[PDB]
Amino acid sequence: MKKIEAIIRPFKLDEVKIALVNAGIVGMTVSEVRGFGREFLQKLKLEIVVEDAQVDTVIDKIVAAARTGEIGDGKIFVSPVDQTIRIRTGEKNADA
Amino acid sequence: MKKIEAIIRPFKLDEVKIALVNAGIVGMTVSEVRGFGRVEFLQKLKLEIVVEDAQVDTVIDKIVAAARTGEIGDGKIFVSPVDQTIRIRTGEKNADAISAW
Amino acid sequence: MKKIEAIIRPFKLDEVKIALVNAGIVGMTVSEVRGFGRQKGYTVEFLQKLKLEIVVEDAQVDTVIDKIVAAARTGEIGDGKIFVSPVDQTIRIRTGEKNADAISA
Numbered sequence: 001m002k003k004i005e006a007i008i009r010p011f012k013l014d015e016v017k018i019a020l021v022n023a024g025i026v027g028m029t030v031s032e033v034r035g036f037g038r039e040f041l042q043k044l045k046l047e048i049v050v051e052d053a054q055v056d057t058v059i060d061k062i063v064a065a066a067r068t069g070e071i072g073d074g075k076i077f078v079s080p081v082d083q084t085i086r087i088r089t090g091e092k093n094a095d096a
Numbered sequence: 097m098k099k100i101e102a103i104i105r106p107f108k109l110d111e112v113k114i115a116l117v118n119a120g121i122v123g124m125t126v127s128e129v130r131g132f133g134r135v136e137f138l139q140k141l142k143l144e145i146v147v148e149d150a151q152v153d154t155v156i157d158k159i160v161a162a163a164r165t166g167e168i169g170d171g172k173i174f175v176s177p178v179d180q181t182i183r184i185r186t187g188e189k190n191a192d193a194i195s196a197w
Numbered sequence: 198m199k200k201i202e203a204i205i206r207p208f209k210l211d212e213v214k215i216a217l218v219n220a221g222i223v224g225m226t227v228s229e230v231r232g233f234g235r236q237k238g239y240t241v242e243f244l245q246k247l248k249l250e251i252v253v254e255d256a257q258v259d260t261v262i263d264k265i266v267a268a269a270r271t272g273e274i275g276d277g278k279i280f281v282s283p284v285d286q287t288i289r290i291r292t293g294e295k296n297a298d299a300i301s302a
């Protein structure tokens with residue numbers, strides 16, 4: 001259980017997002033943030049919780065989607081997730 | 097220390113909050129996000145509550161109890177490790193930093 | 198790699214930022230959040246707060262924390278919190294750099 005967090009350029013969202021649904025990723029959460037700096041630029045923060053096996057793959061897509069041509073495209077941080085539970089049912093881990 | 101991140105339906109916020117206060121949770125942090133889970137993005141709330149390991153499950157059980165509706169889209173909860181938690185005002189650490197009597 | 202997350206008072210941003218610029222921090226990401234604690238202000242529900250996310254090497258963690266605390270503290274209720282969480286990987290989109298290469302200049 002890993003959390004991939006990709007801060008990217010706003011307009012790239014759609015492009016990236018579509019790729020992710022084609023990767024078999026069920027869900028993600030997008031927030032709007034400001035980034036610094038090269039003073040603060042409008043950027044999107046993508047949070048996707050996936051299985052350990054898919055991390056690199058997902059990453060490889062995100063970067064592929066988020067690349068442009070100039071400095072400031074974004075960053076990607078992978079963090080551990082200890083537990084994931086679904087609210088409607090109460091399922092845990094892989095079921096969620 | 098553990099970090100509970102609950103993506104829930106917006107209107108449920110208040111209810112959840114009450115549960116947490118009745119759970120003895122003093123504080124939390126809420127941000128606005130858009131989510132999709134089975135264009136397709138829905139307005140949802142993100143609650144961030146840092147608790148003690150021992151308190152994790154109970155808190156979860158409360159959150160789920162409050163944020164549940166029974167319909168698809170209720171949201172999810174992720175527990176992640178936090179290596180340090182410090183209160184800025186005092187300099188307190190761990191349980192002291194997120195509890196106040 | 199470690200992720201320092203500092204939820205602070207809005208107006209303190211600049212100030213903390215200055216510390217970080219003096220700390221040798223190249224970049225950071227700030228989001229706007231609502232918070233709940235002891236401080237309030239019907240009566241104020243959730244209060245406007247800033248969320249800072251900085252990914253650094255473990256060695257730089259304490260120093261940065263000590264800087265942030267030095268800058269964002271007031272002595273009154275509502276100053277905020279700081280949580281450090283582990284980060285297993287950090288990647289730059291442009292090149293594909295990993296770890297220390299992706300967040301340092």
Ligand SMILES: Nc1ncnc2c1ncn2[C@@H]1O[C@H](COP(=O)(O)OP(=O)(O)O)[C@@H](O)[C@H]1O
Nearest residue numbers: 027028048049088131132133134168169170171
């Ligand atoms: N893999 C994921 N990573 C992060 N957030 C997710 C993920 N999957 C779903 N979510 C969040 O959950 C919400 C929808 O939950 P959903 O999957 O519909 O729950 P359920 O299956 O119980 O209906 C979305 O708005 C999204 O914010």
Ligand SMILES: Nc1ncnc2c1ncn2[C@@H]1O[C@H](COP(=O)(O)OP(=O)(O)O)[C@@H](O)[C@H]1O
Nearest residue numbers: 035036037038071072223224225226250251252
């Ligand atoms: N320490 C950090 N933690 C999280 N995000 C960062 C950090 N440093 C830079 N970033 C992200 O990188 C984006 C822009 O990169 P910047 O640091 O301005 O120069 P460069 O594009 O050369 O990396 C910013 O939006 C910011 O959110």
Ligand SMILES: Nc1ncnc2c1ncn2[C@@H]1O[C@H](COP(=O)(O)OP(=O)(O)O)[C@@H](O)[C@H]1O
Nearest residue numbers: 123124125145146232233234235236274275276
């Ligand atoms: N468990 C928690 N998780 C996340 N953020 C918290 C938590 N407890 C408090 N906070 C943050 O602290 C702010 C106010 O809390 P408060 O009790 O005034 O802290 P302090 O006692 O350090 O002044 C809120 O805006 C909230 O974002």
